[PDB]
Amino acid sequence: SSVTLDIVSASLDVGEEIVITATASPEGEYSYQWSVDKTGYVSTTSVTGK
Amino acid sequence: TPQVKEFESEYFVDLPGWGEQTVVDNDGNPSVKKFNWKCERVRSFNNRLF
Amino acid sequence: AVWNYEFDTWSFRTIPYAQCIGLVDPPVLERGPIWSDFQEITWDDPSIKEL
Amino acid sequence: NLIWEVSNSSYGSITVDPSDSKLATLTSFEKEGNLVVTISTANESVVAQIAVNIIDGDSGIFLSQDTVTIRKGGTTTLTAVTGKTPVTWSSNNASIVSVTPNANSLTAVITANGEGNVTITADNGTKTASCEIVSIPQIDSISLSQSDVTVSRGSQYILTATLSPANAPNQNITWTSSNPNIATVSGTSTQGTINALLAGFTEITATTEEGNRVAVCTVRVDL
Amino acid sequence: VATVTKKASASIKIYPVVSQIVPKESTISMNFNQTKNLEVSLLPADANNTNLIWEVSNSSYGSITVDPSDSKLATLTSFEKEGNLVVTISTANESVVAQI
């Protein structure tokens, strides 16, 4: 069903870290695939994890 | 690390520049950073190292 | 029809109805086993005799 | 034309009404949280997004993650929302889990040191939020390959212990067995149980250095 | 195959990193008398998006050599002794350590 995130904006500085968590409405088991609009500017790890 | 030994030195030391990678921040501001690089074999060829 | 490119000779043979073919390492029992691996195997050839 | 849509349309009796000609109005409700406003076109694959945060007052604060479960050695992050830039953190039981607010002071990094509940919190000066944390060991259970082994004089059969998670950092095993005079084992998942007598049962039990102290038990049978 | 899919919007803002690199100093050096307390005037590179921390080596050349900067800068003093020293204007945590 509809999915929502508690985080919509953030302010960072080069060198600082942050972690976001995805949570769908139902508690079922699903697959995740993160995307980025502009290549670079960030580094990801384990994109298949919530 | 490969741990080269200079010709004018009497002790072993890590290779210079090993791990160096140029990063460009917003507006095109360059900077350098060293990362944990680990290799398995290193040789010489054409006055270069591999 | 097998051909040897080292001496230029032709020969034939039979295969067991191959839909495909390839090279790969064998199971652990044929990739080089160890005495202390047959902790569950016995001399009663439990479905394994061609060893 | 376009179509204005908002996720979780529960922040107002009429959150966003149908745009008269091109645009519509916005409202609010007496609750906080994070949402997204998707301004989607008629049918084409054009879906924008607008992030708004209800501060819950004038300078209130609310954390993104309320409850967290971290494994030893791991790390997480926290996000706050306020109007005042100065954001001083304060966590009870400080020396069980560390915190390092970033430059913006609206984000802080967590670092788990050892098992133990923590209730890291912030303090804007008027309001205050909380974030329950429950540190869990790197392991939840273990398992062996045999439980009814049988050996003879001198024979020493090797046992394996496959941890529940596929991997465990800084993991180590120190095998224990009451009255080691009958046999001794140690090292890692590989046991290599040695037999000394021809009779007398034994209780080979694991003792994971890290992870939950919870272990297993095996009953040797020399006869 | 994915029968159902749902997207999640999430924006992020990365403050500029330009001018946060090592700053430049106008008064690279300043000599004063024995017990003079001439104030110090300087600015980092645009003094934008970050603060700094003023440190001085051998903090024994005054009852209070350099006090905590009120907003961005602090004052200087002296003592009745000579010698060479260095004033390191270090940033919060980044690897930026100047010298005067």
Side-chain angles (χ1 to χ4, degrees), chain A residues 15-40:
Chain A
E16 189 169 354
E17 321 181 8
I18 196 170
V19 165
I20 56 172
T21 185
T23 53
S25 159
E27 86 305 339
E29 290 188 2
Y30 318 90
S31 297
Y32 315 85
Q33 268 286 340
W34 263 258
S35 88
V36 56
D37 60 333
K38 286 197 291 182
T39 307

Side-chain angles (χ1 to χ4, degrees), chain C residues 5 9 17 22-25 30 34-35 40 42 46-48:
Chain C
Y5 68 87
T9 191
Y17 300 73
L23 189 85
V24 67
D25 288 323
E30 292 80 355
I34 291 161
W35 286 97
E40 306 171 346
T42 179
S47 75
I48 43 177

Side-chain angles (χ1 to χ4, degrees), chain D residues 36 38 48-51 104, chain E residues 8-11 15 49-50:
Chain D
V36 289
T38 53
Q49 192 168 252
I50 285 170
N104 283 109
Chain E
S9 178
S11 183
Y15 269 90
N49 193 250
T50 49

